[PDB]
């Protein structure tokens, strides 16, 4: 077991997803944590669009990355391209990952769907390579 931080370059209204998906997905295998990289709250939509799936997210962003340690983490996860708006530490674990996918936000159900789909071939590829 290790575990992840799950992020992108700003957390305001951004709905991420990945993080809530690792956990539902692979508990027993990983801990899973997401912050922001600014004073910030994942989108309120987020929670709704998650719970389609049963995932539970409510109040998951409560402190900034920088405020946590990077070595703790095996794997850090930026959703959004690069993680850039973050401190070195955070891009140089092993596993520090460069997703290139879309955020929810600004768009329709159909595309939380379409991110839920992309989201959850993704992190069943990142756990099946971390375990």
């Given amino acids: 077991m290790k575990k992840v931080m799950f992020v992108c370059k700003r957390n305001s209204s951004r709905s991420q ?7 539902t997905l692979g508990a027993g ?27 539970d997210i409510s109040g998951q962003t409560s402190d900034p990355i920088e405020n946590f340690n990077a070595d703790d983490y095996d794997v850090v996860i930026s959703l959004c391209g690069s ?21 929810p936000d600004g ?3 159909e595309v939380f769907r379409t991110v839920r789909g992309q989201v959850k071939e993704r992190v069943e590829n990142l756990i099946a390579k971390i375990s």
């Fill in 29 to 55: 295998k990983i801990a899973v944590t997401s912050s922001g990289l600014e004073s910030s709250r994942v989108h309120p939509t987020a929670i709704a669009m998650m719970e389609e799936v049963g995932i």
């Fill in 83 to 103: 993680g850039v708006n973050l401190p070195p530490e955070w891009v140089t674990q092993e596993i520090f990952e460069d997703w290139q996918l879309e955020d």
């Fill in 17 to 23: 997803m990945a993080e809530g998906f690792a956990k």
């Fill in 107 to 109: 768009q329709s159900l």
